[PDB]
Ligand binder design. Structure first.
Ligand SMILES: Cc1cc(/C=C/C#N)cc(C)c1Nc1ccnc(Nc2ccc(C#N)cc2)n1
Ligand SMILES: N#Cc1c(N)cccc1F
Ligand SMILES: [Mg+2]
Lengths: 556, 415
């Protein structure tokens, strides 16, 4: 015999305070019992389980399932109860590689390591918790009792411990062979390289020889799987990648559930198909979650769906990452809070694409949304490539400079250049820093009664211009905005406005260009038409002239 | 060399904090650092039975070329038992903030000489991620006191007091205060004198050590020159309507801090509905009221006290042109310190780098004055801050923060 290195066991514990499972074995038919005994005798001969005495008090139920269209029974040990009681483990699969971060490879070989799986021993002190019982024929003798010596299929810790064990074994090979990449998925190792096929196949042989040090055998008849690989919803090819086929169904009427599956397909597609849009289709999912309810598609949702079908007409592929070249990210505004982007290195060859949607909020503007989209792409790019792309943005350098120097928050976007591709992001209005000489001064106020919802909004000016409007179904906040709106409506192109509304100042100082409030939207439209606006705040109820007069008029 | 027993607080599991995305340069640096640390026995590889995690990244301390590993133990620090066995982290020295020169030393390398309690090590787990998750993240835990963990200065305290006994009795007027991985050394000497005493200090830790990669550095502060921001009102010969409205607005705000502030006579100047730019002469009654307000604003705020049991809160306002104002308080309108910056380092076109530097400087002031870090209210969108602050961070501790999404009207009053 050739000595082999043992695979070190991972020590395993139950959660604090918990004991092992003690679950009743279900009754089985005489036919299922004979099948399980045969199966377990083979497993025992292979070292995977061992018979135990009657002292062990734990138990997990075992089942027999007919492998469909076969007289072959299959065993199922149901570890749901032990899993609830088993400690949490470190999970590595949490982060999956994105295809766009991979490197092109000339050759990728697959190796089956299914037999290696159960060379992995289970912590000797944990085995007792895996006990199960085959019932006896006619229940006239004690059932046969077994426990696992290897990682059981379906037990909570088996994926993590298998992965950790294989990683430890592969570490030295990978380190001493930096000209290959190795990736484990399920019971297969994928080995890629840029070596000529001869040297590449030599590396594979050497890996098989390395694995033999632990007694892990790999099939000689080489794997049937060969590029392209279907993996995690992608298609990986040697020199390009894409998503698996995206087919939007034809439907005369659409259900809640159908729309959820359509949006999921579109979201999946948006990582390589440029320009996918989902706003109007996601609008139909607002609030409701009755999975069978039918919703009429608005005309705007049909337009969006139609546009997406066109985008999905023919296949699109991404290229892989070349670390020797800069990464570039370009962003376009699509309308209704939607943004789309492409990341590339050579012109017209995208590594990937994607999209960003406006966050839920009362007020917003395009510059803020562009900024959020940039941060999202930056963070995604650190994940995939470990570096920030150079940005191409549809906003003039002078617009950005004005925005960030005057904005009340700190804000930053990394190295970028203007791309003159409409629609451009611009500043729709800017307020004055100083009062305007020669411009009429409007002192505005509004008030409402909380019981009747009746209110008033209005202004008085230094020229004696005055207006008060009676309002119904309103609030203090709404009347304060209404007063500013009236002053904007009734003034010339330059205007000073004096308000005591901290609420209205808080909104206007946020510089929105769009709002969920149609009153704020009306104010924005008036601001866009002015040449100069200065907005001054004063405290309420302090005898400030102008403010005092109009407050009396509107609170009457 | 024998381990101090360490526990978490009751009914409290270890940290399970997600590792955030790291650039290629920071991953390469951490791989190199951690490979060395592992060889030196400071850390060891761990297996999947350890599910804990604390984030790690890397920084370049101010004026250096070499990466420093920085573990973000904020969560582990919250969950770690409090250390009151005997010495209570030393009653804060109130004289440190009065010295002419305070030099900050990174002494964290000293902690690696003390082993960490075998049963507590698992809670120090961290992961070096790989780009695109292409290879399994490298998992380690600490075998020795880690830098940045609250327990390390506490457990090492006994050994630190003994290292500097010779230097302390030789230099009894020197204030030496330890916070986390920093040693703060304050004297009233001339700076050339000061730097020599600092270098004297380094040798005590060099000689005890027998090499620390950042012990040679020195961050020089001068707390006796630290400036504050009282409330001041304009002195003008011509007041416009707009000027007086701004004045009454600022005085109304100040009257929440100072009882006897009045605005009645000033408001009366505005009787009518006048153009904002029209000049209004001050009457005698309004001038008297204004002088009386100025006099009130020269006195300290009443009923201001520091409570070591309460959080310190720091607010910051962006004033433009590189200028930042800030206030530290525990109760609203009871400021314990206010201040203003402008000399923000090589960041004339980067708001977020300037804010990150401001945050560090305020935290340093907080440590020097009260011995703990404040909770920041930052004028920035969470996503922007989280994407960038680690690129500009140069301190070995990390404070807590929250985000301000609505523009404060009071920014005007601190300008
Ligand atoms: C993540 C990953 C999944 C699979 C396979 C998963 C499955 N099924 C195979 C490999 C080798 C890898 N690892 C890496 C690492 C770096 N570059 C690459 N590039 C790369 C991979 C596959 C193809 C192809 N065809 C081309 C290039 N792959
Ligand atoms: N697969 C794999 C792998 C790898 N590429 C590097 C280190 C350890 C591992 F397990
Ligand atoms: Mg009013």
């Amino acid at each position: 015999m050739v000595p082999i290195s043992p695979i070190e066991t991972v020590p395993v514990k139950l959660k604090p305070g918990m004991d092992g499972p003690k679950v009743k074995q279900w009754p089985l038919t005489e036919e299922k019992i004979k099948a399980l005994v045969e199966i377990c005798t083979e497993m025992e001969k292979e070292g995977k389980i061992s018979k135990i005495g009657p002292e062990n008090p734990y138990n997990t139920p075992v089942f027999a399932i007919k492998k469909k269209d076969s007289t072959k029974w299959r065993k199922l040990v149901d570890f749901r109860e032990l899993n609830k009681r088993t400690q949490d483990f470190w999970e590595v699969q949490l982060g999956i590689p994105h295809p766009a971060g991979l490197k092109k490879k000339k050759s990728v070989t697959v190796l089956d390591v299914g037999d290696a799986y159960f060379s992995v021993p289970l912590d000797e002190d944990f085995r007792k918790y895996t006990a199960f019982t085959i019932p006896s024929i006619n229940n006239e003798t004690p059932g046969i009792r077994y426990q696992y010596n290897v990682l059981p299929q379906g037990w909570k810790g088996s994926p993590a411990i298998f992965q950790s064990s294989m990683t430890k074994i592969l570490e030295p090979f990978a380190a001493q062979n930096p000209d290959i990449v190795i990736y484990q998925y399920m019971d297969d190792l994928y080995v890629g390289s840029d070596l000529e096929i001869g040297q590449h196949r030599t590396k594979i042989e050497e890996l098989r020889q390395h694995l033999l040090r632990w007694g892990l055998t790999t099939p000689d008849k080489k794997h049937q799987k060969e590029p392209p690989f279907l993996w995690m919803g992608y298609e990986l090819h040697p020199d390009k990648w894409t998503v698996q086929p995206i087919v939007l169904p034809e439907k005369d009427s659409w259900t809640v559930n159908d729309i959820q599956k359509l949006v999921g397909k579109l979201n999946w597609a948006s990582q390589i198909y440029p320009g996918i849009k989902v706003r109007q289709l996601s609008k139909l999912l607002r609030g409701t979650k009755a999975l069978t309810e039918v919703i009429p598609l608005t005309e705007e949702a049909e337009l969006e769906l139609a546009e997406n079908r066109e985008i999905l007409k023919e296949p699109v592929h991404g290229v892989y990452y070349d670390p020797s070249k800069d990464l570039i990210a370009e962003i376009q505004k699509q309308g209704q809070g939607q943004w789309t982007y492409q990341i590339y290195q050579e012109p017209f060859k995208n590594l990937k694409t994607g999209k960003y949607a406006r966050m839920r909020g009362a007020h917003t503007n395009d510059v803020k949304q562009l900024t959020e989209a940039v941060q999202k792409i930056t963070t995604e790019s650190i994940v995939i490539w470990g570096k920030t792309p150079k940005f191409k943005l549809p906003i003039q350098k002078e617009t950005w400079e004005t925005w960030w120097t005057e904005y009340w928050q700190a804000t930053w976007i990394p190295e970028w250049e203007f791309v003159n591709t409409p629609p451009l992001v611009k500043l729709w209005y800017q307020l004055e820093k100083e009062p305007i000489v020669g411009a009429e001064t409007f002192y505005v106020d509004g008030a409402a009664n909380r019981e009747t919802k009746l209110g008033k909004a209005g202004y008085v000016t230094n020229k004696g211009r005055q207006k008060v409007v009676p309002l119904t179904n309103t609030t203090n906040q709404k009347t304060e905005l209404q007063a500013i709106y009236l002053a904007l409506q009734d003034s010339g192109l330059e205007v000073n406005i004096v308000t005591d509304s901290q609420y209205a100042l808080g909104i206007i100082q946020a510089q929105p260009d769009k709002s969920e409030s149609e009153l704020v939207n009306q104010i924005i439209e008036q601001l866009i038409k002015k040449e100069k606006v200065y907005l001054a705040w004063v405290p309420a109820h302090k005898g400030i002239g102008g403010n005092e007069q109009v407050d009396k008029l509107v609170s009457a | 060399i024998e381990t101090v027993p360490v526990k978490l607080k009751p009914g409290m599991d270890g940290p399970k904090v997600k590792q955030w995305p790291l650039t290629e340069e920071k991953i390469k640096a951490l791989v190199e650092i951690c490979t060395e640390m592992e060889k030196e026995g400071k850390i060891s590889k761990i297996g999947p039975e350890n599910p804990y995690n604390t984030p790690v990244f890397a920084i370049k301390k101010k004026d250096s070329t070499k990466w420093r590993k920085l573990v973000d133990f904020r969560e582990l620090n919250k969950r770690t038992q409090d250390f009151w066995e005997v010495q209570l982290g030393i009653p804060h020295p109130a004289g440190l903030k009065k010295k002419k020169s305070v030099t900050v030393l990174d002494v964290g390398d000293a902690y690696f000489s003390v082993p960490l309690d075998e049963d507590f090590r698992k809670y120090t787990a961290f992961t070096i991620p790989s780009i695109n998750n292409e290879t399994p993240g490298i998992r380690y835990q600490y075998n020795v006191l880690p830098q940045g963990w609250k327990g390390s200065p506490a457990i090492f305290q006994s050994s630190m007091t003994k290292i500097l006994e010779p230097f302390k009795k030789q230099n009894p007027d020197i204030v030496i205060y330890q916070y986390m991985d920093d040693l703060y050394v304050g004297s009233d000497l001339e700076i050339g004198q000061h730097r020599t005493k600092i270098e004297e200090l380094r040798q005590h830790l060099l000689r005890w050590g027998l090499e620390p990669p950042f012990l040679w550095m020195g961050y020089e502060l001068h707390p006796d020159k630290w400036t504050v921001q009282p409330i001041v009102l304009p002195e003008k010969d011509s007041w416009t309507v707009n000027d007086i409205q701004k004045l009454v607005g600022k005085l109304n705000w100040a009257s929440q801090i100072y009882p006897g502030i009045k605005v009645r006579q000033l408001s009366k100047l505005l009787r009518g509905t006048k153009a904002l730019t029209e000049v209004i002469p001050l009457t005698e009654e309004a001038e008297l009221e204004l002088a009386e307000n100025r006099e009130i604003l020269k006195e300290p705020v009443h009923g201001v006290y520091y409570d070591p049991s309460k959080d310190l809160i720091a607010e910051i306002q962006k004033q433009g042109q590189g200028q930042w104002t800030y206030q530290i308080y525990q109760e609203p309108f009871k400021n314990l310190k206010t201040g203003k910056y402008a000399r923000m380092r090589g960041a004339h076109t980067n708001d977020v780098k300037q804010l990150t530097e401001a945050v560090q400087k305020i935290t340093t002031e907080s440590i020097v004055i009260w011995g703990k870090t404040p909770k920041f209210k930052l004028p920035i969108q969470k996503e922007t801050w989280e994407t960038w602050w680690t690129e500009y961070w140069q301190a070995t501790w990390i404070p807590e923060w929250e985000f301000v999404n609505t523009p404060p009207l009071v920014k005007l009053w601190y300008q």
